[PDB]
């Protein structure tokens, strides 16, 4: 859906920006510094769910640029593993949110964050 | 969820960027230049659905900046009307997509686009 590689870059960056906001805004809740409203969190994680699936299609062939390391393309299977592991941890966060359990939510949140960071450490400049 | 007004700006711009991609990528389909796969479109409009609800919460009090006209805040009821009309036209596009009918889709797509543009004409610098 991208006319030029730069359009794919702008898309994936914008998707990541929204991901960071919908993930990060729960930090005060998982830490207890903000109240836990199970319905609020369930709704937010559904938004994060949808957003979390979007960046990967914007790393197609020929879309090298931005802060994406070239290894994303030459090591496609390893990058796909990182993305699917991340999306699997998103499924677990959704389950914790849907269950309404703050303990489970704080564990699942941590697992998601570690997945974000493991991918950045390997594949983000 | 925004530490500083600039964070709200960056959010709403990124949400708009994704909206433009998930709306605009259907142009070749509504024009007939690309094939119409009803399931593909139904899935894409569900993504657009979710995205379409996101910008408005990032125009809260004190988040003046970017290319947002100050009138968004001093004419809050008119801006809310523009956003709700837009979201209502998104509901109609969802119904056309869910029904699998290209004629309906091309009419609803046009209505959505006009709603985007009417808001920009009034409230985007
Ligand atoms: C690989 C499987 C990744 C996972 C999982 C996550 N991110 Fe990521 N992110 C990745 C890349 C390769 C890039 C660079 C994209 C480019 O072309 O520049 C990014 C970028 C970001 C950014 C910065 C975006 C910007 O405005 O430029 C953020 C804020 C970001 N990513 C956040 C983020 C979060 C919160 C994640 C888990 C919830 C996450 N990313 C996962 C690759 C991958
Ligand atoms: C008001 C009710 C709006 C509707 C409906 C739509 N948009 Fe919009 N958009 C609006 C404002 C006030 C702004 C400026 C935000 C800022 O602070 O700068 C925007 C911006 C955009 C942009 C540019 C984003 C960027 O990268 O800076 C785009 C591409 C955009 N909007 C697209 C868009 C589409 C495709 C819409 C309907 C599907 C749509 N917008 C609706 C306000 C409003
Ligand atoms: O909110 C965020 O979480 C991840 C990472 O910091 C988690 O360790 C990331 O890259 C964000 O923007
Ligand atoms: O794809 C888009 O559609 C609207 C407008 O051009 C429709 O008239 C907009 O602002 C986009 O980025």
Numbering used by the authors:
A (entry chain A), B (entry chain A): 1 to 125
Verbatim from the authors:
Cytochromes c′ occur in methanotrophic, denitrifying and photosynthetic bacteria and have proposed roles in protection against nitrosative stress, NO trafficking during denitrification or pathogen defence. All cytochromes c′ have a 4 α-helix bundle structure containing a heme centre with a solvent exposed proximal His ligand and a buried hydrophobic distal pocket with a non-coordinated residue (Leu or Phe, rarely Met or Tyr) in a position to exert steric influence on the binding of diatomic gases. Unusually, cytochromes c′ are able to utilize both heme faces (distal and proximal) as a means of discriminating NO from other diatomic gases. In order to understand the factors controlling distal versus proximal NO coordination, we have examined NO binding to AXCP variants in which the occluding distal residue Leu16 is replaced with residues that are smaller (Ala, Val), of comparable size (Ile) or larger (Phe).
All of the tertiary structures are similar to wt AXCP and only salient points concerning the heme region are discussed here. Ferrous structures show the different residues at position 16 to lie over the heme in a similar manner to that of Leu16 in wt AXCP with the exception of L16A where the side chain is essentially truncated.
